[PDB]
Amino acid sequence: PREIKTLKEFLAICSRKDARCVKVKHNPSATKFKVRCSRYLYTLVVNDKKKADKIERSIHPSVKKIAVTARSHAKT
Amino acid sequence: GRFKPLAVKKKYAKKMNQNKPVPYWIRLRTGNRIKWNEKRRHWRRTKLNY
Amino acid sequence: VAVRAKVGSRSYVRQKQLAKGKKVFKIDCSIPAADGIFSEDVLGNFEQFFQDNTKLNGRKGKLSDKVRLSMNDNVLTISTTMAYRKKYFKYLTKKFLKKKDLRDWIRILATGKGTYQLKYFN
Amino acid sequence: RKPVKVHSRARWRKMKEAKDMGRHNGVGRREGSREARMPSKELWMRRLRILRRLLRKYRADKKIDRHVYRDLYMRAKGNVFRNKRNLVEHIHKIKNEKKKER
Amino acid sequence: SCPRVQYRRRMHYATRGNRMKMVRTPGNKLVMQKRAKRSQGIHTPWVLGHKRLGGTKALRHIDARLASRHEKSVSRAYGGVLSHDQVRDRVVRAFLVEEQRIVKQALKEHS
Amino acid sequence: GRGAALARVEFRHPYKFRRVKELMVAPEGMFTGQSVFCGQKAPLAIGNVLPL
Amino acid sequence: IKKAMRKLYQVKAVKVNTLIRPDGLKKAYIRLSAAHDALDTANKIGLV
RNA sequence: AGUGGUAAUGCGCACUUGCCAGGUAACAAAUCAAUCCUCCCACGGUGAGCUUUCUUUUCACCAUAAUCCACCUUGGGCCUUUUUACUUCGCGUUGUUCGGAGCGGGGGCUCAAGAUUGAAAAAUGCAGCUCUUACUGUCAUUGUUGUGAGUUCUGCGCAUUAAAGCAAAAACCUGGGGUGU
RNA sequence: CCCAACUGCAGACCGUACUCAUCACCGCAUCAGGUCCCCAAGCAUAGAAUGCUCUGGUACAUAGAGAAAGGUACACUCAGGGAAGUCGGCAAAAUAGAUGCGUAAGUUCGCAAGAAGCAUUGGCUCUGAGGGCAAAAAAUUGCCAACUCAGAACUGCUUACGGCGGGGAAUCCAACUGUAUAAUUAAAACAUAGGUUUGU
RNA sequence: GCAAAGAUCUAACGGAGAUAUACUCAACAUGCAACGUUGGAUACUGGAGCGGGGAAGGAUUUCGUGCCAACGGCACUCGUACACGAGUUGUUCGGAAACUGAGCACAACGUUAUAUCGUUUUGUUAGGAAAGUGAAGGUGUGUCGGCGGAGCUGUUCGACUUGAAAAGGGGCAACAGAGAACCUGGGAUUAUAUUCCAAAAAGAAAUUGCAUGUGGGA
RNA sequence: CGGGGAAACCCAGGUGGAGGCCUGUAGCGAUGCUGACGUGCAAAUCGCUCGUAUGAUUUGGGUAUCGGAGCGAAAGACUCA
Ligand SMILES: [K+]
Ligand SMILES: [K+]
Ligand SMILES: [K+]
Ligand SMILES: [Mg+2]
Ligand SMILES: [Mg+2]
Ligand SMILES: [Mg+2]
Ligand SMILES: [Mg+2]
Ligand SMILES: [Mg+2]
Ligand SMILES: [Mg+2]
Ligand SMILES: [Mg+2]
Ligand SMILES: [Mg+2]
Ligand SMILES: [Mg+2]
Ligand SMILES: [Mg+2]
Ligand SMILES: [Mg+2]
Ligand SMILES: [Mg+2]
Ligand SMILES: [Mg+2]
Ligand SMILES: [Mg+2]
Ligand SMILES: [Mg+2]
Ligand SMILES: [Mg+2]
Ligand SMILES: [Mg+2]
Ligand SMILES: [Mg+2]
Ligand SMILES: [Mg+2]
Ligand SMILES: [Mg+2]
Ligand SMILES: [Mg+2]
Ligand SMILES: [Mg+2]
Ligand SMILES: [Mg+2]
Ligand SMILES: [Mg+2]
Ligand SMILES: [Mg+2]
Ligand SMILES: [Mg+2]
Ligand SMILES: [Mg+2]
Ligand SMILES: [Mg+2]
Ligand SMILES: [Mg+2]
Ligand SMILES: [Mg+2]
Ligand SMILES: [Mg+2]
Ligand SMILES: [Mg+2]
Ligand SMILES: [Mg+2]
Ligand SMILES: [Mg+2]
Ligand SMILES: [Mg+2]
Ligand SMILES: [Mg+2]
Ligand SMILES: [Mg+2]
Ligand SMILES: [Mg+2]
Ligand SMILES: [Mg+2]
Ligand SMILES: [Mg+2]
Ligand SMILES: [Mg+2]
Ligand SMILES: [Mg+2]
Ligand SMILES: [Mg+2]
Ligand SMILES: [Mg+2]
Ligand SMILES: [Mg+2]
Ligand SMILES: [Mg+2]
Ligand SMILES: [Mg+2]
Ligand SMILES: [Mg+2]
Ligand SMILES: [Mg+2]
Ligand SMILES: [Mg+2]
Ligand SMILES: [Mg+2]
Ligand SMILES: [Mg+2]
Ligand SMILES: [Mg+2]
Ligand SMILES: [Mg+2]
Ligand SMILES: [Mg+2]
Ligand SMILES: [Mg+2]
Ligand SMILES: [Mg+2]
Ligand SMILES: [Mg+2]
Ligand SMILES: [Mg+2]
Ligand SMILES: [Mg+2]
Ligand SMILES: [Mg+2]
Ligand SMILES: [Mg+2]
Ligand SMILES: [Mg+2]
Ligand SMILES: [Mg+2]
Ligand SMILES: [Mg+2]
Ligand SMILES: [Mg+2]
Ligand code: NA
Ligand code: NA
Ligand code: NA
């Protein structure tokens, strides 16, 4: 796994052709945007919730968006 | 143990497939002389040592 | 450890004191109070039980003002500036229920931080 | 799934309190040799390490100069000082003599 | 509930190349994981003293293969083979011995 | 199995660009870094090899 | 085995796991790509 | 067509199995420190046991895999500076030492073991439970201390008694030359 | 054509069950014999001794009834005497841990030696000694952890788990540690270091 | 005789294995003794274990269902018995591909009436011509560079066609030496699992071999 | 590191951890009971007792030497009862 530092290079990761999906994780103190690429899972950590909402809308519509939840054993 | 050559494993496979009783319909043939398999093997009685 | 212990000191064992006090524990007996087992007279010696049985600095009965016990809103509230384990009032509760032959009826359970509620076995 | 059977350390903890106060460790209760229970090398290592730590602290604080430090360092290795207090008392005797000479 | 472990690969002998470390998993299981062998590190020649070289790491096989070149040497001449003091001795020796030869040769030619 | 010490002496190849590194029985007093002379014109010194 | 599956059944195998059984025969666990449905081809094969 | 630093050496600087030279692989007692882990404490949460009498109690659990990013503790080697450092000396180990062939002190370079921050990773695991059956949902907990005791991973070798001195090779690494020129 | 960070595609072969033993192997057998490696808890204690216990495992090895003689035992005891037994103290008994004091002849000076011998030991309640860290005669002021040893008063014993040398005076032999007749001989036999001789 | 390794008791359920009866007769004195499972009880092993995994050896003894003629020296409703039907999943684990060791002995040579004999690692076969590999060039092709007027000359680097230097034939022998890119979670089995899980792969990686495009050199 | 001595050197404490050293597990053996058993659990075993247990030590796998031959710290021992 690799950490994305700034938002400018995060949009470059999602723009890649091998970015299958973006997993949005809602932690109580931060929001993580985990981009599943071919070789690495790139993560951008956003602490401010207002910025996280703005960033989520800015995600390209080509990349599928997955909202990370706790899937149940019965569900799985 | 885990290790065995494939040739040894194949010899043991054939011995496993031969360790069967005679089919019932064999005993109903016209000139049958076979009542039971006289070459039945048990892993505790006789060893193969492959 | 630093100072060798004496047998005579077991008469008065020092109990810890919080820096910023007013720690509150709550016993929620709402579920069994509706069934009448926790009656007016039962509630009397219930809080009385928590009064003279709760130990302080090793000694028992002399609660003084370090520990405050109150009854309102159908729940029991214990407030103290001293350092106490939350399990202690679960252990005191189990002592009471055994004394009144209720341990096979009422189970005490943890709902949150500092709260114990009394329910029934399903 | 049933709970495990209870193995309790209550008696051991009570006995630990008594032993911490000095019970159940007299002459009649000892089965191993004195060195087996408390090796003399371990006692020597602790004592010499204490003496060397104190001399370093005194040298760094400029309570003793390097010549006094070196003299006491060799004497600590030579089993001259029985414990920390014995070394401190000797340093006071040296310091008192230097003041009179001054 | 004190745990005991088993070999999880197919080598069950406690040799120097099969060392194990106890590992507690996120599933609260105590398992055995193989420790990687370590290389002693890049050394000066055995005849010269066989000392570890400054500025060079101790990488084994594939880690040494994949590492950057400057992890295994220094920019000085003979970097990663000889130490700084050994390099200085050779530079001084090369100049001084070659100077003595010229003086001896010039004396013979002049005579 | 041998009481006497052994010496590894490095020579240059007389015909090729390489070293030789011969191994001989060390005489007493031979030391690492000593120069060894072998041949017709070698001086008479301990460790040198000379025609009889 | 992967190539034979393509020729015989026109399905794509993403993974083939093989083992030699104790009776001497070789058995293959063939996972088909998510595009194909294993139940559907099993019906076509005739095993249902 | 590499480059910085007085230096120890730093930096992401092309090709090299024509050739040559080194290194890794590669081995080693004891003493003392001791890793991951194990066991004990201390404090605190969760559940259970005992409860005629005592017991702020007894028991259980409180977990974080590889792989990566960023970069103060100990040990070793080294550099620079001050060396008027050893005249009836100093630094260091439990221990057999060490120093003008450069000790100690100041400031540094580097290597080895570990801290620590973060990605992974809570979305997992564990325990109890709300609701009401579906191997259903809701929800609560989800730890830190220890100059404690073990623990050969490691520090650790030109490294053991020795008339005992402790395999090799493949594979790989770096350089010297040379090519680029 | 060669480097960097990616990316796309593909990663072939054999082994993989179970066992590893008081039932899975060898011993004719589900035989008290034999068979290499790893992980290894708590208390007592010097402890991988020995005893008991949480986890895991087990109640499987023909059973029931049940004081004959005579047996076998990884079972005991015995008044008075104490080796009178016997080829022979065989067997059994005995000594026993730790600590202080003390210890002969002989000797290759290393030992002999735990020589031989005396004495103490429980439980309780105490008192000293043995440290770490932090804070500007700091020769004090705070906080705190792990234990060990020693000394007192009081109070006890029916000498009371396990484990754990009997000792001394002499002769013969071999210097010693070792080896060695698997299945009747472990020795004084063999080896050994040391000494000598021979061939080259 | 079936006596070393301490040991079993109780209720219920299951089972044909019972509470099994001419007269007389309320029950005892006329169906005994033995089984498996579950819950309780009691005890043992006591971490150098009747624990959990492997090598050698064994080779289906593993698993489920059924079954009780023989066998498990007593017994069985039980079984490592019998019958039927199943189970062993790997780019990374072990081996091989692909290292050397104590060693072996193919070739070669020699010997022997006879090769079914001897030599064959002290760097190393053999009176012994055992290298088919190839620096650099010359000569064409492909990717570049510079010059002057898309071409021309010269040039760098890979493909095709002159010959430096490389002595000492080919192989085996380690599943504990060397080497070796994966490791957690699972509600994933009746039985396999660092081997199975499929788009939110529960997932996170690491490594080879080819390619394509981008960036930069040629 | 103390104490003596003109010198030579001697006497005292500590540190350290040597040894085909000692007690003693596992391991490797086998002394006595001339114990048990002796149609055995066993064509050599069992119990207690006993030797040794850092070394000339014990042990896995691999490899090398054999039938008038091999190997043997030597008993004519061992070379698949
Ligand atoms: K294995
Ligand atoms: K012998
Ligand atoms: K031959
Ligand atoms: Mg096996
Ligand atoms: Mg076999
Ligand atoms: Mg000592
Ligand atoms: Mg090293
Ligand atoms: Mg470097
Ligand atoms: Mg396979
Ligand atoms: Mg080395
Ligand atoms: Mg398997
Ligand atoms: Mg298996
Ligand atoms: Mg086993
Ligand atoms: Mg058998
Ligand atoms: Mg046989
Ligand atoms: Mg034991
Ligand atoms: Mg024990
Ligand atoms: Mg148990
Ligand atoms: Mg049995
Ligand atoms: Mg039984
Ligand atoms: Mg029997
Ligand atoms: Mg009798
Ligand atoms: Mg007599
Ligand atoms: Mg008589
Ligand atoms: Mg007589
Ligand atoms: Mg006797
Ligand atoms: Mg005397
Ligand atoms: Mg005489
Ligand atoms: Mg003798
Ligand atoms: Mg001995
Ligand atoms: Mg002897
Ligand atoms: Mg022998
Ligand atoms: Mg005999
Ligand atoms: Mg005998
Ligand atoms: Mg003799
Ligand atoms: Mg003599
Ligand atoms: Mg009879
Ligand atoms: Mg009998
Ligand atoms: Mg029995
Ligand atoms: Mg039962
Ligand atoms: Mg009846
Ligand atoms: Mg009946
Ligand atoms: Mg027991
Ligand atoms: Mg027992
Ligand atoms: Mg234990
Ligand atoms: Mg076991
Ligand atoms: Mg079965
Ligand atoms: Mg029977
Ligand atoms: Mg069968
Ligand atoms: Mg079948
Ligand atoms: Mg030869
Ligand atoms: Mg060889
Ligand atoms: Mg050859
Ligand atoms: Mg030759
Ligand atoms: Mg091979
Ligand atoms: Mg093997
Ligand atoms: Mg290996
Ligand atoms: Mg592998
Ligand atoms: Mg299994
Ligand atoms: Mg010793
Ligand atoms: Mg000895
Ligand atoms: Mg001994
Ligand atoms: Mg002895
Ligand atoms: Mg054994
Ligand atoms: Mg007898
Ligand atoms: Mg008899
Ligand atoms: Mg023994
Ligand atoms: Mg033969
Ligand atoms: Mg004879
Ligand atoms: Na046969
Ligand atoms: Na057996
Ligand atoms: Na009987």
Topology:
The structure is cut from a larger assembly and holds 7 protein chains of 7 kinds.
Chain A (H helix, E strand, L loop, with lengths): L1 E3 L2 H8 L6 E6 L4 E6 L4 E6 L2 H10 L5 E4 L9
Parallel strand pairs in A: 1-4, 2-5
Antiparallel strand pairs in A: 2-3, 3-4
Chain B lengths: L5 H13 L32
Chain F lengths: L5 E4 L12 E4 L27
The site of one magnesium ion (MG) has 2 residues of chain D, from helix 3.
Chain E binds 4 RNA strands through strand 1, strand 2 and helix 1.
Protein name (chain A): Large ribosomal subunit protein eL38
GO biological process, one term (chain A): translation
GO molecular function (chain A): structural constituent of ribosome
Can you walk through the features of this model?
The structure is cut from a larger assembly and holds 7 protein chains of 7 kinds. Chain C is of the alpha+beta class and 122 residues long. Helices cover 25% and strands 29% of the residues of chain C. Chain C has helices at 30-33, 40-52, 86-99; strands at residues 23-28, 55-56, 59-60, 67-72, 75-80, 106-112, 115-120. The longest helix of chain C has 14 residues, at 86-99. Chain E is an alpha+beta fold and 111 residues long. Chain G has helices spanning 2-9, 38-45, and strands at residues 13-20, 26-32. Chain G has a two-stranded antiparallel sheet. The structure holds potassium ion (3 copies), magnesium ion (66 copies) and sodium ion (3 copies). One magnesium ion (MG) is lined by residues 40-41 of chain D. One magnesium ion is lined by residues 40-41 of chain D. Chain E binds 4 RNA strands through strand 1, strand 2 and helix 1.
Number of strands of chain C: 7
Report the radius of gyration of chain C as a whole number of Å. Answer: 16 Å
- Oligomeric state of the chains present here: part of a larger assembly
Structural class of chain C: alpha+beta
The largest sheet of chain C has its strands arranged as: 4-5-1-7-6
State the distance separating the first and last CA atoms of chain C: 48 Å
Protein chain pair with the most extensive contact, residues per chain: B-G, 8 and 5 residues
Whole-number radius of gyration of chain G?
12 Å
| Largest pleated sheet of chain G | 2 strands, antiparallel
Number of strands of chain G: 2
What structural class results from the helix and strand content of chain G? Answer: alpha+beta
Helix content of chain C: 25-40%
Strand content of chain G: 25-35%
Q: Give the overall shape of chain G.
A: globular
Offer a concise description of the structure.
Chain G: It comes from Leishmania major. With 122 residues, chain C is α+β, with helices and mostly antiparallel strands.
Keywords:
part of a larger assembly, 7 chains, B: 50 residues, mainly alpha, 1 helix, 26% helix, G: 48 residues, alpha+beta, two-stranded antiparallel sheet, 2 helices, 2 strands, 31% strand, binds potassium ion, binds magnesium ion, binds sodium ion, RNA-binding, ribosome
